Amino acid sequence: EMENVQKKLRKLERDYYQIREQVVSAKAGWCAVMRMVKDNGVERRLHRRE
Amino acid sequence: IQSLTARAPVWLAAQDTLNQLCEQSGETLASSNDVTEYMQQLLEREREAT
C-alpha cells in the first residue's frame, strides 16, 4: 500500500518544483513593473485592489 | 470568511471613493456625523461666497 503513496508523492513533487519555477520567474519579471510603479504615477489610478 | 469575502468588494470600492472624495477636501472624515458637520461648514462657506 505504502509504495503507491510513494509514487503519488513523486507526482506531487514533479508538480511542485515546476510551480516554484513559474512563481520565481514571474516575480523576477514583475519586479520591473513594480519599479515602474515607483515612478509614482501609481495610485488607485493604477493599483485597483478591489 | 465567505461572508466577509462577499462583503469586501462593496467596502473596498466605498473606501476608494471616500478616500478620493476626502483628499479632495482638506480634511479626513471619520464618522457620519463628521460628514454632517462638514456639510454644515460647506453650507456656511456657500452662503458666504454667494
Binding site: 516554484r20 512563481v23 520565481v24 516575480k27 523576477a28 519586479c31 | -
Partner: protein, 72 residues
C-alpha cells in the same frame, strides 16, 4: 562564489542591488518584503538550491545572514 547565488537571488527577488543587503538587516521590515514576499523569497532560494527547507526552518531566515548560514 556559491553565496553569490543567495546574495544575487535575494537582491533579485526584493528589487535591491547586491550591496543593499547588509547581513545585519531583517527581511521582514528592513527589506520591506511582506509575508507573501518572504514566502516567495524562501521558495526561490529553495528552488535555486533545489534543496528542501521546511517552513519551520524557513521561519528563522528572517535575517540576511541566516540565508547563507543554513545553506552552507
Amino acid at each position: 562564489t556559491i553565496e553569490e547565488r543567495v546574495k544575487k537571488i535575494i537582491g533579485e527577488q526584493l528589487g535591491v542591488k547586491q550591496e543593499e543587503v547588509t547581513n545585519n538587516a531583517s527581511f521582514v521590515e528592513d527589506l520591506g518584503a511582506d509575508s507573501l514576499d518572504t514566502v516567495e523569497l524562501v521558495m526561490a532560494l529553495e528552488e535555486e538550491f533545489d534543496t528542501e527547507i521546511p517552513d519551520e526552518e524557513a521561519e528563522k531566515i528572517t535575517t540576511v545572514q541566516a540565508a547563507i548560514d543554513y545553506i552552507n
